[PDB]
Ligand binder design. Structure first.
Ligand code: SNO
Ligand code: SNO
Ligand code: SNO
Ligand code: SNO
Lengths: 252, 252, 252, 252
């Protein structure tokens, strides 16, 4: 079928896009960098199995893909944002608006623009790539964490109404997902190179390692394949056992 | 001590302000209608125990209450919004921006404006009156429901950093809370007078009745009293046992 | 690899065993009826791809499968119990001891018996088929519901310690899962043939239908395949969007 | 009114019993130590404001109190158990049965024996003192943690059916609750005396301290007073912000 993966160069983009691609799907890709013709061309040449789009806005992206490839069967909203950690009184209100805009309004807008075609055909799959931070908040990251929670609930609430149209909706909230070269949010440097960060991941995850793009890709492909639509409304915590909780003194 | 209750004329406003006042707090009250001198003076006359303020924005409100009453010991962010039930494709992206601005940005702005003084003296209480809809979402109310979820997580996230400063943070998510003359969100009419609505309430809640302003106010006063600060980060589902789930055929 | 599926003739048993077998696993099957040679040989004849075992207790079952097939790579604890709906005062304390023995003690006993070999080689997968009732409890089923919750948490708790040994642990909590000829818990008759039951399902689930054995089996195979071990600790609500919550009067 | 607090000498017993007592309630108390006449007498003399009972079994305790003081209005099931931390393969199955018996079956039995009188009068309050471990499991404590989860869900499930009889049911799951001289579960030594344990509590809780018996007492008295029955079904995490999640390297 035809799928859309946003911010393909970051977060769970390449894992999602490529696995969906390997599955035989036509994968249209979005990314801020695709604004530049040079960037989009370099990407189109490196990945002939993918279809990079120049469109940046939600409804515009949806239309470009629909016209270009017939329709949109699967939506993978790979949302990102660059938040600063900071005491609540140190943030500017605009810092919260920014997080909400990028992490809640964006996925809402994408679904708002594609739900019509999916509901008429009574077929489609919606997947939000959110975050596992809501499951275990770190102090001083209130903007990002609460915005991600809003997106998680958005997905669950959507499943309630789209199910009547045979449209499953899921939310995958990862953490410690190896992002390789992308700074969103666990790049090879220093997460796989620095002893201190490696020790950190070892301590906070049950599997004692970072998650892989392959794992995220496998889940997205599985959910989009229609093999288990009965899981609709599910929020998947892709965080390898995180959070591991500090045990009493005397325990290893 | 001094407490601030926003949108006092609606939702959990009156219950919170009245009970807080009885507990001994000087209660500064905010409401959109207070922009008008005639509305503020009328309220002030009906409720001499309350202290209605005219300030409308978060920053100026906290400053105003601080000048008049020395400081802000308790913040009750009684947030409201007038949403409509709509299939996701029938909403305008603007309708979600509106819900988030009213239900997430606003309480964030209030805490952002008052956190400094509370942290400086290491004392204070923050209470968000959110919603129980995230616990059990209805079809076609994705905007309001997801935004309320963002606020709930915001409260829990904030509890993690403010606890270091001895400042507890809580979220009270009601549903089926009798709002008397306020349209937000269960006015006496029709919820207590129309056969179909009355029956609906007896069906969807375990206690088979609407929640009262007194119960909400009792909880607010209890949490702000300092009697149980160890509950910090808690999201209280004030919905009388809602949601009651449809049982198998034949069961009474 | 080798997988074990318990109570194979009921609940999520057939879906799990059949799909696991298709994936390439040698599937050892347990069932209470296998105590009888006539029942075991009949099953073995109908499903030549499956390997029915006669062993009934956890310890002997794992030992038996280990001798015959070398080792146990995947454990699917498909636990069942025959509860009755009863007001708490109408239950006998014995009825709860029974539910807990069947829904908590049993899976605990299986993991307790197989964990050693999995940890020694640092590989394996553990899947508990629990229930989604804890997500949305019905009145008068406190025994079964609370016991299933104990099992779900058992799975999540186990994921924390076994992750160190590269052993993922998951819980699949279904509801409205078509059990075909099995009375546990949604047999084709009446759930797919009686007007009232059929209508009930369309009302309480988002997808408005029963879950299929194939969907459950797809999930089991996917989790045991090693494609997404990073989901360890996850409780999957396999209930098609259940529970759907009663909306206000007048709404279609 | 008349209340029953079990295992009064341990966990949240003294905080509950005494505060309920200070409120003017007739508080009948149970404790294993009360088996010995000497023990019960020493307690009766030290606390004339409390009514220690010799009965040990659920139904027996309920009858003794009912006959002695007319009826049972409030039930505070202060359940305890002494679990060992241990890899799942190192536990004996009996270790899980023991935890379940003490943490699930006991509270179930108490409610099973008192629900009748409360439902006929259509008045009463049920409070389970469980644990916050299910909210954030430590590795190698699978028996205790999962049993507590079962009790938490038991309370929520019970609220669904008892609400029709105006009977609120709550679960209070504490952690890091100062137990003073009781070994269940955070005695003064070494939790308040040892620098290492003090540093631990400081790190894992948001309020950076142990919870107090007064705080637990205040919540139990509040819930039993009937001031906020609309919170029925609520599970209260009385753990002071726990769990605090390890932040990235470089963060304070
Ligand atoms: O900004 N951060 O520090 C941050 C940290 C972790 C994540 C996880 C969800 O992917 C996102 C963002
Ligand atoms: O707009 N509605 O339909 C609505 C319904 C219920 C609530 C609950 C949170 O108080 C708010 C709004
Ligand atoms: O006994 N019942 O009524 C019952 C109902 C629903 C389920 C769900 C978990 O598969 C099990 C049992
Ligand atoms: O046995 N332990 O190690 C233990 C630890 C913590 C608690 C918390 C719930 O009160 C109970 C038991």
């Amino acid at each position: 079928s035809t799928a859309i993966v946003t911010n393909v160069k970051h977060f769970g983009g390449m894992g999602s896009a490529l696995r969906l691609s390997e599955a035989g799907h036509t994968v249209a890709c979005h990314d801020e960098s695709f604004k530049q013709k040079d960037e989009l061309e370099a990407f189109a040449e490196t990945y002939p199995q993918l279809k990079p789009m120049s469109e940046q806005e939600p409804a515009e992206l949806i239309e470009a893909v629909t016209s270009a490839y017939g329709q949109v069967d699967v939506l993978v909203s790979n949302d990102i944002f660059a938040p600063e950690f900071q005491p609540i009184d140190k943030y500017a209100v605009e810092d919260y608006r920014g997080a909400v805009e990028a992490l809640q309004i964006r996925p809402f807008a994408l679904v708002n623009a594609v739900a019509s075609q999916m509901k008429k055909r009574k077929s489609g799959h919606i997947i939000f790539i959110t975050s596992a931070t809501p499951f275990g908040p770190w102090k001083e990251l209130s903007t990002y964490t609460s915005a991600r929670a809003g997106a998680c609930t958005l997905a669950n609430a959507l499943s309630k109404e789209l199910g009547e149209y045979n449209i499953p909706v899921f939310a995958i909230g990862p953490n410690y997902l190896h992002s390789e070269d992308s700074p969103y949010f666990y790049p090879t440097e220093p997460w796989k190179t620095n002893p201190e960060h490696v020790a950190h991941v070892k301590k906070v995850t049950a599997l004692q390692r970072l998650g892989t793009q392959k794992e995220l890709g496998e889940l997205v492909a599985f959910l989009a394949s229609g093999s288990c639509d009965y899981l609709t409304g599910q929020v998947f915590w892709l965080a390898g056992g995180f959070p591991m909780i500090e045990r009493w003194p005397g325990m290893p």
